[PDB]
């Protein structure tokens, strides 16, 4: 069965697998360790970008607001912001950069605009997400130490919230469409969930990778002849310098979207 397949996948993997799939046709779920906490790593960037989108609903000038980028703002991984040092980027452009290129500088600018990590947590709570917590900025939010509660959530909680964000009640229509547009245009997720799906299915996703071989992806999936699917695949390992394992995410995705 699907459960037996996920079990067999995890047992050979050398780590701990978390899966939550929501089928919006009938709200049915496929769950594996879905109530267990995992370090989000860069999948947390979705929540920060969405918090700014929510603000923009009541401030029509916000998304085009200029943000100065400086050399000092650059951190371990910032492919887009490094192009704009000495100039500016709009908050919209920073959302796009954070979500589609996993730009760490962009993420931090979004957090600083909002007033710090705790403000991203409060936003998640306003959406009925009682699990999500953001504690640190980038890149330290990727330390993914086993048993550390900082910057974690559960697969189910994140799947529920991603559904609410992309297909449900969380955002205004224009902003919801913008989030969906951003996720669909992600460039960093080829080898993760996307690689376990039929090639012509439309997909939006956000990856995240960190220490302890922590390898994550969260996605919204639109089949050709069926209602959407929301999928969270989280994976983490016992040793600090373990290699990341996108291949496990692709394999989980294939297992739980089988036949369907």
Swiss-Prot record:
| Residues holding substrate | 206-208
Positions annotated as active site in the UniProt record: 42 (acyl-ester intermediate)
Q: Does the keyword Lipoprotein apply?
A: no
Decide whether keyword Signal is in the record. Answer: yes
Q: What class of enzyme is it?
A: hydrolase
Q: Catalyses which reaction?
A: a beta-lactam + H2O = a substituted beta-amino acid
* Sorted UniProt keywords: Antibiotic resistance, Hydrolase, Signal
InterPro entries from the entry? Answer: Beta-lactam/transpept-like, Beta-lactam_cat, Beta-lactam_class-A, Beta-lactam_class-A_AS
Q: Additional info?
A: The class A beta-lactamase family has a specific amino-acid numbering system, sometimes called Ambler or ABL numbering and often misspelt as Amber. A multiple sequence alignment was used to derive a consensus sequence and then the consensus was numbered taking into account insertions and deletions. This allows use of identical numbers, e.g. for active site residues, despite differences in protein length. UniProt always uses natural numbering of residues, hence there appear to be differences in numbering between this entry and some papers.
Say which family it is in: Belongs to the class-A beta-lactamase family.
State the protein's name.
Beta-lactamase CTX-M-97
Provenance organism: Escherichia coli
Q: What is the lineage of its organism?
A: Bacteria, Pseudomonadati, Pseudomonadota, Gammaproteobacteria, Enterobacterales
